[PDB]
Amino acid sequence: RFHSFSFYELKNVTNNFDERPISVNKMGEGGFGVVYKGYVNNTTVAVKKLATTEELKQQFDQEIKVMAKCQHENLVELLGFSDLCLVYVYMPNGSLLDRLSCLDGTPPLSWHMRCKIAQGAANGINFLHENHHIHRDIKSANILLDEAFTAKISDFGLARATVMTSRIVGTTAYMAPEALRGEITPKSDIYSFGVVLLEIITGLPAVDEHREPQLLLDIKEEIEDEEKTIEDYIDKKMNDADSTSVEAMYSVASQCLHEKKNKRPDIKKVQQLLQEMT
Numbered sequence: 161r162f163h164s165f166s167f168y169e170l171k172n173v174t175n176n177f178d179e180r181p182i183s184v185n186k187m188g189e190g191g192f193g194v195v196y197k198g199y200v201n202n203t204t205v206a207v208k209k210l211a212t213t214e215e216l217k218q219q220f221d222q223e224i225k226v227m228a229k230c231q232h233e234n235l236v237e238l239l240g241f242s243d244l245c246l247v248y249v250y251m252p253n254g255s256l257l258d259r260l261s262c263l264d265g266t267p268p269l270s271w272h273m274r275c276k277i278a279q280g281a282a283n284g285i286n287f288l289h290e291n292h293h294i295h296r297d298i299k300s301a302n303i304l305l306d307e308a309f310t311a312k313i314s315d316f317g318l319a320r321a322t323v324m325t326s327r328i329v330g331t332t333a334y335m336a337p338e339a340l341r342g343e344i345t346p347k348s349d350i351y352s353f354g355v356v357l358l359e360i361i362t363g364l365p366a367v368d369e370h371r372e373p374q375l376l377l378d379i380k381e382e383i384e385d386e387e388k389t390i391e392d393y394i395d396k397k398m399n400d401a402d403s404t405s406v407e408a409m410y411s412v413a414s415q416c417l418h419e420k421k422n423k424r425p426d427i428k429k430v431q432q433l434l435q436e437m438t
């Protein structure tokens with residue numbers, strides 16, 4: 161199995177959960193918790209300080225359940241656990257969301273790096289779908305990046321092993337229409353990945369209230385109606401994007417973003433398509 165640690169041991173590393181910006185321990189908030197920079201001698205760690213009492217505890221448990229079962233180079237690594245805390249290997253380059261937006265002065269990702277991240281993220285979703293798991297929250301904030309900008313699929317608090325649910329959970333800007341209806345399907349993860357791919361091409365967030373269109377997925381409709389093209393939306397913060405591979409990534413995202421779930425490709429086909437692109 162895997163390593164288990166006491167609450168008294170982890171209370172120390174965090175410098176007693178000092179919520180402070182590292183620009184002058186709080187490195188950012190994440191969904192139902194908050195991440196703090198922790199240590200274990202010579203290996204830096206990330207501590208998920210979790211903040212419905214019964215369901216927050218079961219989201220902490222499912223994470224440990226899926227992480228113990230699923231180990232891959234394109235998935236984050238859980239080191240320890242336990243008021244609740246979750247301990248991970250610190251990802252030096254944070255989220256794809258923050259790197260796409262150049263948060264805290266980080267330089268823009270090149271097209272070449274964007275392609276490897278997309279292939280990386282597709283391989284991690286493939287491993288999860290092979291092991292009969294549905295992520296349920298595929299988004300760029302959940303794609304973490306290590307020391308070599310290797311994509312790592314994160315957050316499994318909502319993960320599940322064509323079934324319906326009463327309480328609908330996820331990120332609305334990334335959700336498939338059937339997921340918004342209550343359905344649970346691996347095909348909904350493909351749709352969400354289609355939105356991530358568009359964020360990679362455009363460098364635009366999936367939703368921006370002070371923008372028209374508010375939703376990034378709406379640009380698929382603007383392009384098909386020949387109102388605009390993909391070149392109008394390519395991230396301008398790159399010098400190495402070529403139309404052939406950019407139009408090839410868009411074709412994969414467009415296919416993923418089909419309204420009819422059975423008309424969408426499987427993760428193995430998406431994975432196959434991104435490999436043909438390079």
Ligand SMILES: C[C@H](F)Cn1ccc2nc(Nc3cnn(C4CCN(C)CC4)c3)nc(NC3(C)CC3)c2c1=O
Nearest residue numbers: 187188195206236248250251252253254255264314315
């Ligand atoms: C469930 C998931 F796997 C848990 N997990 C695991 C690891 C992890 N590692 C980081 N590393 C990190 C954050 N910022 N930077 C910066 C530092 C400043 N520099 C300018 C750019 C890179 C590096 N952040 C995390 N979360 C976010 C994104 C803060 C919210 C997580 C995280 O949430």
